[PDB]
Design a protein around this ligand. Sequence first.
Ligand SMILES: Nc1nc2c(ncn2CCN(/C=C/P(=O)(O)O)CCOCP(=O)(O)O)c(=O)[nH]1
Ligand SMILES: Nc1nc2c(ncn2CCN(/C=C/P(=O)(O)O)CCOCP(=O)(O)O)c(=O)[nH]1
Ligand SMILES: [Mg+2]
Ligand SMILES: [Mg+2]
Ligand SMILES: [Mg+2]
Ligand SMILES: [Mg+2]
Lengths: 209, 214
Amino acid sequence: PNFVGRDADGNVTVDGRSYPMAESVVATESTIHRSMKEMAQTLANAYKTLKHRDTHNKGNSALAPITDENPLIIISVLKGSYIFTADMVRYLGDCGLPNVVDFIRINLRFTELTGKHVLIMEDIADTGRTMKLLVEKIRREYRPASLKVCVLVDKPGGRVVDFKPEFVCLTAPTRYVVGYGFEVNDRYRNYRHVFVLKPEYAKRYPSKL
Amino acid sequence: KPNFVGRDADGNVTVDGRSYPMAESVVATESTIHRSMKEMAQTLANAYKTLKHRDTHNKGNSALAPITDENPLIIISVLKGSYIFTADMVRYLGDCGLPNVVDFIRITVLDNLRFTELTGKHVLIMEDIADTGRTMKLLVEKIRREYRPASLKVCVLVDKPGGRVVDFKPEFVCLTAPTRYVVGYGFEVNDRYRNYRHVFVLKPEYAKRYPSKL
Ligand SMILES: Nc1nc2c(ncn2CCN(/C=C/P(=O)(O)O)CCOCP(=O)(O)O)c(=O)[nH]1
Ligand SMILES: Nc1nc2c(ncn2CCN(/C=C/P(=O)(O)O)CCOCP(=O)(O)O)c(=O)[nH]1
Ligand SMILES: [Mg+2]
Ligand SMILES: [Mg+2]
Ligand SMILES: [Mg+2]
Ligand SMILES: [Mg+2]
């Protein structure tokens, strides 16, 4: 468990390291990983028994269980979800749920999604527009057996369209957060904890990368 | 967390009691992997923390700038096999206090970089493995020609030097592997086993186990 405090200048510290950009801590690494570990069991319990189209043996007409032959299809949204997805699939492996990951940037190279169980792994749902558009696009272009969304952070106070993620690790207020995949022009993406950003830092790096 | 390698009643390799029927042997357990990544982050921090490169945060500045959050180390992560490696390493680099930003490239070039200001920057390629050396040889040449960065270096999780058909030497290597096909921790066969925490040598009987297109 990480120790959260304040340094001599009032900056947020976690495990003795100062974070001058942070207004406060939303969730430390150990809290995030506990939430994701429980979510991995939640995802395993929801999918381990399901069956979907057999593409390993196309000669088999029946529905096949979720195995290494026909794993769960996971769509990971770059770039904000790559660190979240990296830890989740390993926790899913701990829970014995076979899965494969392809990436989308808002494109995939997976093509046999029809009749499959597909799970989207996204960093955050705020207004809901990003995932509302993605689910509609995947459903119309692939028609999976099922399509669900797992987000690391949900902001239900920001929802302005009709979208609700089925699986949520953390619930946050309508504040701009950084760390553990979240960033300000890619800065702070590699931090192990999620912080509320100081508004003074929101426009700190305006130059294009 | 020290891992225990053994065999089950059927003769399959086990790591911490979990059976891996696809594995012929263990190249490196999770603790071995993360120990080398922790030491590599220190090596990378020491090699870059005092260097300077072009200031693109303040375009009105003419002097070279240190590596800061304003002008961080540019990391190019090669999809897909390097994404788990990259996710762990950049967090270890944060532990070492090395500011960095990550963009992704996919090559067979399928997905291009979105970063555009690499000229005169220190750029670090993060790749999962170097086998024949071709993929990285071509990628080093393309980035050098297209951008001319201040420095361009390659950090691989696994080096297989016994497989070289071209002359390529990555500057930083976490682990060395025998000239075998490995799976686990980013490495896969048709995307299977990518999420395993240990690197195994795959059994030859599993080489073409999943031929169907995903
Ligand atoms: N770092 C951070 N980003 C947030 C946050 N909320 C939304 N977003 C936007 C997340 N994403 C922006 C990343 P980009 O590739 O465009 O730079 C867009 C996804 O937004 C979620 P939604 O469509 O509003 O539900 C937040 O709290 N912290
Ligand atoms: N799973 C596995 N793949 C190997 C191996 N060696 C090369 N490769 C090819 C890896 N790469 C593609 C697989 P990924 O999904 O990571 O993008 C190709 C890069 O090959 C390295 P090189 O050009 O031969 O030096 C190996 O031992 N195990
Ligand atoms: Mg992002
Ligand atoms: Mg952003
Ligand atoms: Mg590769
Ligand atoms: Mg930093």
